[PDB]
Amino acid sequence: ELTVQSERAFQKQPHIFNNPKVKTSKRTKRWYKNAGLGFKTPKTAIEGSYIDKKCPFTGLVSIRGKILTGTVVSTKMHRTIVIRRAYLHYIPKYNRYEKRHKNVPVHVSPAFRVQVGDIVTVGQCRPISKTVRFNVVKVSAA
Amino acid sequence: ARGPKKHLKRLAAPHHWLLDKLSGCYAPRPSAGPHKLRESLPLIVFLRNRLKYALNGREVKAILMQRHVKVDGKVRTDTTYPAGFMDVITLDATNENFRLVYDVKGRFAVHRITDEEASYKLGKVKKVQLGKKGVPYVVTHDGRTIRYPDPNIKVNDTVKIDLASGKITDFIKFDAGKLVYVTGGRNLGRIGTIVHKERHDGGFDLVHIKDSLDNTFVTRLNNVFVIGEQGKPYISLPKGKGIKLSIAEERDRRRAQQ
Amino acid sequence: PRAPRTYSKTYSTPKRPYESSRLDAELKLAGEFGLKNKKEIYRISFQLSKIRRAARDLLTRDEKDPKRLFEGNALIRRLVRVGVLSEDKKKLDYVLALKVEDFLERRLQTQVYKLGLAKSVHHA
Amino acid sequence: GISRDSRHKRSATGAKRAQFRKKRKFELGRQPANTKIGAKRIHSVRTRGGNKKYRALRIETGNFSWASEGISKKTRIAGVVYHPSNNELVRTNTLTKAAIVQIDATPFRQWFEAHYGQTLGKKSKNAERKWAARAASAKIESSVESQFSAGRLYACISSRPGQSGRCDGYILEGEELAFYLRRLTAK
RNA sequence: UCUUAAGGUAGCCAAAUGCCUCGUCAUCUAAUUAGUGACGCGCAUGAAUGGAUUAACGAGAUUCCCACUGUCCCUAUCUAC
RNA sequence: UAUCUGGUUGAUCCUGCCAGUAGUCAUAUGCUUGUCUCAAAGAUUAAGCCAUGCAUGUCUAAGUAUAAGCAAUUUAUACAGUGAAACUGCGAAUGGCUCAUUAAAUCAGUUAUCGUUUAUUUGAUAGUUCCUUUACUACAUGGUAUAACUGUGGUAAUUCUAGAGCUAAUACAUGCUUAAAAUCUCGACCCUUUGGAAGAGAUGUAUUUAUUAGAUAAAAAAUCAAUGUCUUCGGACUCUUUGAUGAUUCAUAAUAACUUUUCGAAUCGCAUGGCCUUGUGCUGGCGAUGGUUCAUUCAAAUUUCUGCCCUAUCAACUUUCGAUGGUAGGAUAGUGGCCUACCAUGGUUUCAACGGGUAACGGGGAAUAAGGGUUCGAUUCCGGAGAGGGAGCCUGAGAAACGGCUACCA
RNA sequence: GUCGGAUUUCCAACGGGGCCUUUCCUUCUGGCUAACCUUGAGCUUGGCGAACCAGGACUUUUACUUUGAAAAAAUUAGAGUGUUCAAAGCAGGCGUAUUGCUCGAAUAUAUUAGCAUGGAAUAAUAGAAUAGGACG
RNA sequence: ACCCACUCGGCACCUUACGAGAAAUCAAAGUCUUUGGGUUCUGGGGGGAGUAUGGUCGCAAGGCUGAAACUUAAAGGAAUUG
RNA sequence: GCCCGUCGCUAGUACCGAUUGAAUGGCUUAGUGAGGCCUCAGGAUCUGCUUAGAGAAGGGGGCAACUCCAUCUCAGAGCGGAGAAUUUGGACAAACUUGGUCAUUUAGAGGAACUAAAAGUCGUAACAAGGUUUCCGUAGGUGAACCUGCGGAAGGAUCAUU
């Protein structure tokens, strides 16, 4: 949260190591990746101090499957949010529509800062937790 | 499920096998083999309702155990052996080889040819990667793998297998203007001289394929299988040449040359 | 388990049973075409309604459609093969307006009687 | 009969799911490892498709890698001193993944004296030239040097004793060691 | 019709008020002159001689149940005076 | 086949129902026992109970033999015919039945595994071990009983067994026989220095590290910490390796070590024609058993997006410590509050959560069709659950298995 | 001009594609040396890019149109077929009566959500306000 | 203040209405089988019955919500004949 | 003429109802709690191990007091080792009592509600100004329909006054 090392454990990207014996430029080593599908890794993810092993830019998760867009509705939960997808359902008898909203929780990397009302696109990844199955990939609400 | 499925019933079997709904309630289930469950033709049904060589399951199994037939150069005495697309099965009695090809309407057509076409066959590369000890290899649709391929072979390519050695005599790549064979979907068994492709980054590429009648259609990349360059084929085309003619023209041509 | 074997009905009981006009007309046609029962006119009307509905849902579609052309040609070929319609009329008006009497005056039961090798429809 | 499915778990809306299916062999669970120190008793347990799992109990000696020096030797674990998950684990002195332990490291000391041959604390020509070539790189850190002098290196055992039966690990370097010693000193 | 000043209204009842009476029906029990509910031609209930109801309260008066036990089957033993 | 008619009044026009009418792969019942055709069939109540008998066993040229079985033996001084029983291997997790439970739970369409599956798979094996070792030591290649059998006994007794003795592996702890190259850890030569050729030896396949190759946007000149093949130490210094998708720490190869050790025919049939350095020596071809490996396959597992009947006579629901999320661990074939340790009050909800009912298994689909529709789907195929109610487990690749077991309960 | 139908000179209604009207269909650059400044003796071998593809930004949200995967197979719509018709089923054939092949086993949004390119009318939605504004 | 004209806004009606309605009748009850400007609420034959085991408000009287069993072939509306 | 309500007769239906009663009551901060599984244990039985301490000349031996070598047999104990029988801590968890609505009512004494009632008794409440116009809201009284007091309505017996 506020600091990288708040937890009693040590936060680091697995299987990447910087030698303390040697003294070269860019002493710390961090690893990033391209999320794919034409999504750009932001500078915050590129040169941030966070770890977020469950993020799709520097963590050990993969983005493949469905891509959704929705407006976030809550942020009070840590390192993840819930977006709202306000689709509309068609029924054939009366030949019209009705508004149905589905609330799906999504993990957000510290690379993005999200507030209520933000429009966010998310990508499907492996089951991250009990409810969370998607990962935030881009925010377009400044 | 509690386990794997070991039975298959009629009307629950793939359409291209052409099993009548009467005269039994079960279908010949193909066990583990070189081809998919749906996109393959078992040897028993192939002998039964395509050549009418045998008329009984007992006679078919006896034929199989007496080693009078063989597949791809191997006897393969399996009573429900699955042989799918591009499968070569030669018959020593009169030495006639059958290639299991796809007709225009979408069923397992059989092409009877001679020893040269028995020897040489075509295969579609599924993936190319590196094995243990730094050994590169490929995967084909029938599992006929060749070790140590030439570095030009990439995904979605076709190769020629001599059925005797492990060397790829001919290889044909993937690009515009090539004779193709769509194996899947509603266009089962059509040759349409691939024109272009929409990649759609993320998978599920689409290919524009146009028959000699200028009948242009689209298909998934997972279904098209290049079989040769424009003009000459690598293997003999089946009857009908994979045209899929319009319904009125086909019906009046049947009426005329019935 | 045994694979299912399909069966179908072939006749339709009319919506109202007692018409002094419909019952009387169907009695005339049955008597004058040698029909032992009423279910036979019921089933012949069932086939006539089937073919008329096929013609109607064929005609409701726009002209030159290949499905329309194929279905109409197949229906015309079958109707020419059975022979109830003259083989030099392709306006489809006669096949849509085909009546039960016209359909029945072509089947072999009337043919044998009119050719005279039976001298009676009941005898035939 | 340790279940692993979410069917017994209440839904995200707070609803209690009804009993749909009897729990299966697939989503079974098994008892933890609780690996102790000394007199190794590795137990083999058959899993799905074979694949014998090695439940480590009473592990004695483990393989530890020095990331800076690029070496890994088999040394005896003195005991666990810090565990980020549970302090009860430290109290019972059990060995789990990512656990901070202390090891004899006398393989490591001997390998250091064979590699660099530099006097610490305070003979052929080939050995002389090789030590000269490998010199100018014995400046690891004061904390690591003092820990070596004390004779018990700080390591993180990061293998899975309950899956493989070995408490393989790596020696604490740089920021990792500094952070963990800070936690050890902090109350 | 006799008849008074009026002829017991609302309520309640074998009620601490019912003689007959251990009233009749149901329930509580194996069995109940007990208890509760219900019925009222109520010997002789009944409206500030207050009627009916009522949460809480009661060293008030009855019934049942659980627990518990020498009240009892069926008594025995110990201590102090 | 886009239809109506009878019934309120003395009479009339009306909203309105009660009827009449026609169907049902919708039943039951009463009257008809004449004939080609496939044949629905104990589902509604009682997923209630079962007396009886069956429904899972298994062989080839190619695993072990001798019920004290058969006859030719004429190739066997060890046999390659038949070989019942028993051991080993495999199956029995298929199939068939029913619809009890189940309301985002199944299921349908569509996805993901870069989050995991894999008996026989299957396309083929893998010149790497003579571990007090240049000689404890067989590799013309080791050891024992558990079975049938020879007899003994136990109860009314069970697909019950105690026994004493013979015998086999795909059994066991073992075990080894087949090269050859290149790199790497140490090392008898220099009162020095751009050297190792002898030797001690290590480098196949499972688990932890950590890195290198795991690089393509884009090019011009000084520098140093030390010379690295070699023209003229002005320095030409190049050929130096580099695999797909959008993406991974991907498939990979190597580096001191960890392996307590799982391993690379101590199985069997069929052809046996070539040469002599005489051994039955060297060699001659096929077939079921295997791999700690992948070359997709039959299979399972969770999982993405949408869609389910009636109810507000159900507006709030979700916790001693799972109730949404973060870190770490454990467990799992791996994802995951799946389970534990440590924060906030987090998640759902009038767009109907939650709760209740269902005379609810979900689909393809079944009955009329102008259209839009209203009911039904227990049942011939797919998927799920169960095999008296619950639970918990061994073997097995796969079972919460019931024509497998254990324990409690109509 | 050839009934079981087709034009090479066209008064017209037209599905449509490019040209310029303050409007380059929206790009800085190359692979096959690209429909063209280029050119002995009427057959024109480098300037203005996209006919098959990549390095650099937006492919900004939603409701329609042909397609594809395919909406399991059955079952319905239903071409063809003497089960003697018909329900059905995918059967069924003889001329050189003694050496062939098959006509076939289909073109039908089959409670309807999700992916891909061109079409943007209709109804919203955000672009530059005491300029954190676009161009270099 | 009054009259004569134009209004804007709100309360009422007789032309055999071409409009609507079963008809009384209606400047809306028209622009509705040539059926669609936007929305809320209510009814599905007459009784049982505005009766609920229930739930809420009220000190009470009572208010809101609100059935079913069962019964019935009629109940009712608008004219038209004494 | 139609017609309303008590009351009496018959039958049916539903409701209330003492009886602290009887359909997975699904889970208790619950208590007992088999059985399987993982496990902290002494491994009661077993195969190959050292003949040294036992009766032994022998093969080799100046056949005069010492030996590789087992056997008819027992010793003071260490491994390749499943592990029974049992047993300590757990984690699943059958089945026995309990602050819960039901998706039947049962046995329910009793409580004159409702519809059918049969040619019932008592008076007309309404239908005409029904002889007191009718009807609604509220309140009270009386055998019964009803009556009365207050606010209104016309669905009135008045569309009407100068």
Curated annotation (Swiss-Prot), chain A:
Coiled coil: none annotated. PROSITE patterns: RIBOSOMAL_S17. N-terminally acetylated by acetyltransferase NatA. InterPro entries: NA-bd_OB-fold, Ribosomal_uS17, Ribosomal_uS17_arc/euk, Ribosomal_uS17_CS, Ribosomal_uS17_N. Gene3D superfamilies: 2.40.50.1000. It is found in: Cytoplasm. There is a cross-link at K12, K43, K53, K54, K76, K93, K102, K130, K138 (Glycyl lysine isopeptide (Lys-Gly) (interchain with G-Cter in ubiquitin)). Pfam families: Ribosomal_S17 (PF00366), Ribosomal_S17_N (PF16205). GO terms for biological process: maturation of SSU-rRNA from tricistronic rRNA transcript (SSU-rRNA, 5.8S rRNA, LSU-rRNA); ribosomal small subunit assembly; translation. One of its GO terms (molecular function) is structural constituent of ribosome. Its main location: cytoplasm. Keywords: Acetylation, Cytoplasm, Isopeptide bond, Ribonucleoprotein, Ribosomal protein, RNA-binding, rRNA-binding, Ubl conjugation. One of its GO terms (cellular component) is cytosol. NCBIfam families: PRK08572.1, uS17_arch. Component of the ribosome, a large ribonucleoprotein complex responsible for the synthesis of proteins in the cell. The small ribosomal subunit (SSU) binds messenger RNAs (mRNAs) and translates the encoded message by selecting cognate aminoacyl-transfer RNA (tRNA) molecules. The large subunit (LSU) contains the ribosomal catalytic site termed the peptidyl transferase center (PTC), which catalyzes the formation of peptide bonds, thereby polymerizing the amino acids delivered by tRNAs into a polypeptide chain. There are 2 genes for uS17 in yeast. Belongs to the universal ribosomal protein uS17 family. This is Small ribosomal subunit protein uS17A. The gene is RPS11A.
Curated annotation (Swiss-Prot), chain B:
The modification Phosphoserine is found at S31, S246. There is a cross-link at K61, K133, K160, K167, K173, K178, K210, K232 (Glycyl lysine isopeptide (Lys-Gly) (interchain with G-Cter in ubiquitin)). PROSITE patterns: RIBOSOMAL_S4E, S4. The keyword Phosphoprotein applies. It holds the Pfam family 40S_S4_C. Gene3D superfamilies: 2.30.30.30, 2.40.50.740, RNA-binding S4 domain (3.10.290.10). GO terms for molecular function: RNA binding; rRNA binding; structural constituent of ribosome. It comes from the Eukaryota. The keyword Ubl conjugation applies. The modification Phosphothreonine is found at T114. GO terms for cellular component: 90S preribosome; cytoplasm; cytosol; cytosolic small ribosomal subunit. SUPFAM superfamilies: Alpha-L RNA-binding motif. Residues 41-104 form the S4 RNA-binding domain. Keywords: Cytoplasm, Isopeptide bond, Phosphoprotein, Ribonucleoprotein, Ribosomal protein, RNA-binding, rRNA-binding, Ubl conjugation. It is found in: Cytoplasm. GO terms for biological process: cytoplasmic translation; translation. Component of the ribosome, a large ribonucleoprotein complex responsible for the synthesis of proteins in the cell. The small ribosomal subunit (SSU) binds messenger RNAs (mRNAs) and translates the encoded message by selecting cognate aminoacyl-transfer RNA (tRNA) molecules. The large subunit (LSU) contains the ribosomal catalytic site termed the peptidyl transferase center (PTC), which catalyzes the formation of peptide bonds, thereby polymerizing the amino acids delivered by tRNAs into a polypeptide chain. Belongs to the eukaryotic ribosomal protein eS4 family. Present with 573 molecules/cell in log phase SD medium. There are 2 genes for eS4 in yeast. HAMAP family: Ribosomal_eS4. This is Small ribosomal subunit protein eS4A. The gene is RPS4A.
Swiss-Prot record, chain C:
The lineage of its organism: Eukaryota, Fungi, Dikarya, Ascomycota, Saccharomycotina. Component of the ribosome, a large ribonucleoprotein complex responsible for the synthesis of proteins in the cell. The small ribosomal subunit (SSU) binds messenger RNAs (mRNAs) and translates the encoded message by selecting cognate aminoacyl-transfer RNA (tRNA) molecules. The large subunit (LSU) contains the ribosomal catalytic site termed the peptidyl transferase center (PTC), which catalyzes the formation of peptide bonds, thereby polymerizing the amino acids delivered by tRNAs into a polypeptide chain. This is Small ribosomal subunit protein uS4A. One of its GO terms (biological process) is translation. It comes from the Eukaryota. Its main location: cytoplasm. One of its GO terms (molecular function) is structural constituent of ribosome. Keywords: Cytoplasm, Isopeptide bond, Nucleus, Phosphoprotein, Ribonucleoprotein, Ribosomal protein, Ribosome biogenesis, RNA-binding, rRNA processing, rRNA-binding, Ubl conjugation. Belongs to the universal ribosomal protein uS4 family. The chain holds residues 2 to 125 of 197 of the full protein. It comes from Saccharomyces cerevisiae (strain ATCC 204508 / S288c) (Baker's yeast). Present with 106000 molecules/cell in log phase SD medium. It is found in: Cytoplasm; Nucleus, Nucleolus. One of its GO terms (cellular component) is cytosolic small ribosomal subunit.
Swiss-Prot record, chain D:
InterPro entries: Ribosomal_eS8 (IPR001047), Ribosomal_eS8_CS (IPR018283), Ribosomal_protein_eS8_euk (IPR042563), Ribosomal_Se8/biogenesis_NSA2 (IPR022309). Component of the small ribosomal subunit (SSU). Mature yeast ribosomes consist of a small (40S) and a large (60S) subunit. The 40S small subunit contains 1 molecule of ribosomal RNA (18S rRNA) and 33 different proteins (encoded by 57 genes). The large 60S subunit contains 3 rRNA molecules (25S, 5.8S and 5S rRNA) and 46 different proteins (encoded by 81 genes). Signal peptide: none annotated. This is Small ribosomal subunit protein eS8A. Its main location: cytoplasm. One of its GO terms (molecular function) is structural constituent of ribosome. Residues 1-30 are annotated as: Disordered. PROSITE patterns: RIBOSOMAL_S8E (PS01193). Belongs to the eukaryotic ribosomal protein eS8 family. Component of the ribosome, a large ribonucleoprotein complex responsible for the synthesis of proteins in the cell. The small ribosomal subunit (SSU) binds messenger RNAs (mRNAs) and translates the encoded message by selecting cognate aminoacyl-transfer RNA (tRNA) molecules. The large subunit (LSU) contains the ribosomal catalytic site termed the peptidyl transferase center (PTC), which catalyzes the formation of peptide bonds, thereby polymerizing the amino acids delivered by tRNAs into a polypeptide chain. It comes from the Eukaryota. It is found in: Cytoplasm. The lineage of its organism: Eukaryota, Fungi, Dikarya, Ascomycota, Saccharomycotina.
